[PDB]
Design a protein around this nucleic acid. Structure first.
Length: 58
RNA sequence: UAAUUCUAGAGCUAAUACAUGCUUAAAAUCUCGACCCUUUGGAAGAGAUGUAUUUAUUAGAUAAAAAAUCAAUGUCUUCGGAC
């Protein structure tokens, strides 16, 4: 669908959260505002469409 | 990702952003008290004191005169201690 992954939620799905200032996946327009957005969980599965890979040793 | 002032991973470098942290007069006054050897003693040395926070306890005088008194003392000693 488009949604990104967030480390800390122990589900293989997506859910609605109330994001805050210094946390990733959100960027506030005014000061002191918080929005409810929807983010995808931290467990991989057949639904994904990309994946991040860092070569820690070749 | 069909999509909205949606955003993920990897790589750089700044501040009146964020996090730390030194400098300086002399004086006085307190407490502790090495010693001292003595009467009625005096003393080295030590530490404490900005402002702000919280609690407790004191100063923050005043309507009109003079003695007797208990001692202590500033002082001329008048070694009385009156002042």
């Amino acid at each position: 669908q488009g949604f990104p992954m967030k480390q800390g939620v122990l589900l293989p799905t997506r859910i609605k959260l109330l994001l805050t200032k210094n946390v990733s996946c959100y960027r506030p327009r005014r000061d002191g505002e918080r929005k409810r957005k929807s983010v995808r969980g931290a467990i991989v599965g057949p639904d994904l469409a990309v994946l991040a890979l860092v070569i820690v040793k070749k």
